[PDB]
Design a protein around this ligand. Structure first.
Ligand code: OBE
Lengths: 218, 220
């Protein structure tokens, strides 16, 4: 099997500048007919892959002029003349020379922007859920940057770790921010033994934790 | 207008069998070579199988891990290609996409939207949908509302706000799985001059169970 290598798992870049992504093949992709069988694909979050460049340097129809490709033998490069915020996604190279056809692991393009503090919202269980015997407390930490953030849950001051469900969105294609959802799963019974519920976030935009809480007894 | 459309995915029992279909249009299907590629966490994109055109004797090629279990075929009179999968294992779980090489040297020029295959002995279960309204009072300029979707299986569920009318400040997070099955949340941020004066509704559809639920977000 031909091994396709994309060293960088991701590359940070600021909108407006040019950047390149590289790919290497364990074997020459030059065919007898004289064509070099290496293609580049883009996969935006939640969508199917899409062809950008076929056979090293041919732009597919509909692909923006800012993309170009180069290389030969076993080293290839994908360049952006000017990067745009909407270029967020994962870029894959693929050899189409021998079976089985193989893909590189991909390189995610990350757009750098100004720091953005998360907007934190906490939500007590809906009464509909309580009548059902459940008590999920939800916390949304939205539109922040950079991507790393830490969330802590406190119940009456003491930290809880089990029963916490965390989910993250990909970088937004328009404002380049990230968002996170954190859910504390409790039973109606557990929920009622306590009163203070706290969603605490630690992000680089603040020295002290961002704190949001409410009290069941209200 | 070029398009490839897959169908036939869903929940399937381990050791069971399933057939995926791909319908083409907008290009000379009979000249094209058609392939299936799947995607899963860990392996990323993985080539699965290929069937050539008639001039090339309809020859098939398969990746090692599916040889003997999967069978690819095509029907040019219907501009379709099929992927028959037998003895399904948990490792076959993933998104399957149909793609084609329309002409020599073109690469995988066209791709379908993909269809999710989940191999599991668990059973289909509909979701419960809970509206999430703010505790305190707004103001202040913007208000964030939410929708909690839990207890369903398998994926996916589609969530929209006001039947699609509200799309801008929406974040629908990836589902999380544990003992209560899948739990997914979605939030929407709107001006405080929009809610609660105007009606904000969460619309949830779970194809697998044919469940549809519309829950209004009311001030608590
Ligand atoms: C190294 N080659 C070999 C194996 C992969 C790649 C590919 C290529 O050369 O493009 C193949 O052929 C097609 O995919 C093809 C050929 C004729 C018509 C058509 O629609 C598609 C021939």
């Amino acid at each position: 099997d031909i091994v396709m290598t994309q060293a960088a798992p991701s590359v940070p870049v600021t909108p407006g500048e040019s950047v390149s992504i590289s790919c290497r093949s364990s074997k020459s992709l030059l065919h007898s007919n004289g064509y070099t069988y290496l293609h580049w694909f883009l996969q935006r979050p939640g969508q199917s892959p899409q062809l950008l460049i076929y056979r090293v340097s041919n732009l597919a129809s509909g692909v923006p002029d800012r993309f170009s490709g180069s290389g030969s033998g076993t080293a290839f490069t994908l360049r952006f003349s000017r990067v745009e915020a909407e270029d967020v996604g994962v870029y894959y190279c693929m050899q189409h020379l021998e079976y089985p056809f193989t893909f590189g692991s991909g390189t995610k393009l990350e757009i750098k922007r100004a720091d953005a503090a998360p907007t934190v919202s906490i939500f007590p269980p809906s009464s509909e859920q309580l009548t059902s015997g459940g008590a999920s407390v939800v916390c949304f930490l939205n539109n922040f940057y950079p991507q790393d953030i830490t969330v802590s849950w406190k119940i009456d001051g003491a930290e809880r770790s089990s029963g916490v469900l965390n989910s993250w969105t990909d970088q937004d294609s328009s404002d380049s921010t990230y968002s996170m959802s954190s859910t504390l799963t409790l039973t109606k019974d557990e929920y009622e033994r306590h009163s203070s519920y706290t969603c605490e976030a630690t992000h680089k935009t603040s020295t002290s934790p961002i704190t949001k809480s409410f009290n069941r007894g209200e | 207008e070029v398009t490839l459309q897959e169908s036939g995915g869903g929940l399937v029992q381990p050791g069971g069998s399933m057939k995926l279909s791909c319908a083409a249009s907008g290009f000379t299907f009979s000249d094209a070579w058609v392939d299936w590629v799947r995607q899963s966490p860990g392996k990323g994109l993985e080539w699965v199988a290929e069937i050539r055109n008639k001039a090339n004797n309809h020859a098939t090629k398969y990746t090692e891990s599916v040889k003997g279990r999967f069978t690819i075929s095509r029907d040019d009179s219907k501009s379709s290609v099929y992927l028959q999968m037998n003895s399904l294992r948990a490792e076959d779980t993933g998104i399957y996409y149909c793609t084609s090489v329309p002409q020599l040297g073109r690469g995988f020029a066209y791709w379908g939207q993909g269809t999710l295959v989940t191999v599991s002995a668990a059973s289909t279960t509909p979701p419960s949908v809970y509206p999430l309204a703010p505790g305190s009072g707004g103001a202040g300029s913007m208000v964030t509302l939410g929708c909690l979707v839990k207890g369903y299986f398998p994926e996916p569920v589609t969530v929209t706000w006001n039947s699609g009318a509200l799309s801008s400040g929406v974040h629908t997070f990836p589902a999380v799985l544990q003992s209560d099955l899948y739990t997914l949340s979605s939030s929407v941020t709107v001006p405080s001059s929009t809610w609660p004066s105007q009606t904000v509704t969460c619309n949830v559809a779970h194809p697998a169970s044919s469940t549809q639920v519309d829950k209004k977000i009311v001030p608590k």
